[PDB]
Amino acid sequence: AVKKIAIFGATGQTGLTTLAQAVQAGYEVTVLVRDSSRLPSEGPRPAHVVVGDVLQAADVDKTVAGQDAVIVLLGTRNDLSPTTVMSEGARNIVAAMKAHGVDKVVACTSAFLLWDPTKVPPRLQAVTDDHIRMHKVLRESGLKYVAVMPPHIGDQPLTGAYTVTLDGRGPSRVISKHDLGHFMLRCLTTDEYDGHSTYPSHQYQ
Numbered sequence: 316a317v318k319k320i321a322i323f324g325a326t327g328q329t330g331l332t333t334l335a336q337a338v339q340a341g342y343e344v345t346v347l348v349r350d351s352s353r354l355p356s357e358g359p360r361p362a363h364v365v366v367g368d369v370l371q372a373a374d375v376d377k378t379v380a381g382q383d384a385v386i387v388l389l390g391t392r393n394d395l396s397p398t399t400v401m402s403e404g405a406r407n408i409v410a411a412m413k414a415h416g417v418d419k420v421v422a423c424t425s426a427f428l429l430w431d432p433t434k435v436p437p438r439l440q441a442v443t444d445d446h447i448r449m450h451k452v453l454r455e456s457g458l459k460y461v462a463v464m465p466p467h468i469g470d471q472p473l474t475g476a477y478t479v480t481l482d483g484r485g486p487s488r489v490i491s492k493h494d495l496g497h498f499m500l501r502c503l504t505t506d507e508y509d510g511h512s513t514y515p516s517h518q519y520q
C-alpha cells in the first residue's frame with residue numbers, strides 16, 4: 316500500500332486540509348513549500364519539509380525521491396493572470412517521478428475540463444488554459460494518473476459522503492475543501508480512477 320507521499324501545494328486552501336488529513340490517516344508526508352511560515356504549528360505535522368519551488372527541478376526531485384505517490388494541489392492563490400506555473404510544475408513532477416520510480420499521481424485541475432469548454436467565465440480562462448496544459452502533461456506521462464476536476468471549492472465541513480462521477484454532472488456544483496482532500500487521499504488506495512477524470516460534489520444543505 317501507499318505509505319510515503321509528497322504533496323505539492325500543501326500550504327493552499329485544499330492543501331492544508333489534505334496535509335492534515337493525510338498525516339492523521341497515517342501517511343508519511345513530504346511537502347515542498349516556498350515559505351515554511353505558511354505551514355501551521357497546531358494539528359498534524361508533515362514528516363518532511365523541503366523548502367523550494369516547483370519550478371526548480373532539483374527542489375522537485377528532492378521532494379519526489381523515495382515516495383510511493385504524489386498529490387498535486389498547486390494553484391495561483393486567486394491570481395487570475397496568464398500562467399504556466401502549474402503545467403511547468405507538473406512537467407518537473409513527472410520528470411522526478413520517472414527519475415525515482417514513482418508511478419502514481421493524483422492531481423487537481425477543475426470541472427471546467429469536464430463541462431462545456433465554451434462556458435468558462437472569462438476571468439478564469441487563463442488559469443483554465445494552464446490546467447489544460449497540466450492535464451495534458453499528466454495524461455501523456457504514462458504514469459498512473461487520477462485527474463480530479465472539482466467544482467467550486469467551499470468551506471463546508473468534512474463529510475466523506477460526497478458523490479464522485481466521471482462526467483461532471485452530479486448532485487451539486489460545490490465540494491468542500493475538506494471533502495476534496497479526503498477524495499484525493501481515497502485515490503491513493505484504489506486503482507478504479509486511474510486514467511479517468513473525476514468530479515466530486517455534494518449537497519451540504
Ligand SMILES: NC(=O)c1ccc[n+]([C@@H]2O[C@H](COP(=O)([O-])OP(=O)(O)OC[C@H]3O[C@@H](n4cnc5c(N)ncnc54)[C@H](OP(=O)(O)O)[C@@H]3O)[C@@H](O)[C@H]2O)c1
Pocket residue numbers: 323324325326327328329330347348349350353367368369370388389390391392393400401423424425426442464465466467468469
Ligand atoms: N477556487 C475554486 O473554487 C477552485 C475550483 C476548482 C478548481 N480549483 C483549482 O484547484 C486547485 C487547488 O486550489 P486551492 O484553492 O486549494 O489552491 P491555492 O489556495 O491557490 O494554493 C496554491 C498552492 O500552490 C502553491 N504554489 C504555487 N506556486 C508554487 C510554486 N512556484 N512552487 C511551489 N508551490 C507553489 C502555493 O504555495 P504558497 O503557499 O507558497 O503560495 C499553495 O500551496 C487549483 O489549481 C485551482 O485552480 C479551484
Ligand SMILES: O=C(O)c1ccccc1-c1c2cc(I)c(=O)c(I)c-2oc2c(I)c(O)c(I)cc12
Pocket residue numbers: 390391392393394395425439442466467468
Ligand atoms: O474560489 C473563489 O471563491 C474565488 C475567489 C476569488 C476569485 C476567484 C475565485 C474562483 C476561482 C479561483 C481560481 I485561481 C481557480 O482556479 C478557480 I477554477 C476558481 O474557481 C471559482 C469557481 I469554479 C467559482 O464558482 C467561484 I464563485 C469562484 C472561483
